[PDB]
């Protein structure tokens, strides 16, 4: 309680080393959204952390 999961709106294939790939519906906890467009996140599927394009997720 007191936190929000995010969900992927679309599939995404990561292209750069620090980025996560994911499929539509995958759930995330956001770790840092303060440094621009690309948010640091943890996939709740894999447990991996990396950047995701913020326009590809929305709050649950």
């Amino acid at each position: 309680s007191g936190t929000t999961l995010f969900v992927a709106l679309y599939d995404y294939e990561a292209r750069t080393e620090d980025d996560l790939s994911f499929h539509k519906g995958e759930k995330f906890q956001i770790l840092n959204s303060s440094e621009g467009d690309w948010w640091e996140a943890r996939s709740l599927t894999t447990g991996e952390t990396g950047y995701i394009p913020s326009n590809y997720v929305a709050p649950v």
């Binding site: 080393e17 620090d18 790939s21 621009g36």
Partner: peptide
Amino acid sequence: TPSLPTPPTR
């Protein structure tokens, strides 16, 4: 992978 560098200014 992914293999490409992440640009530091992104």
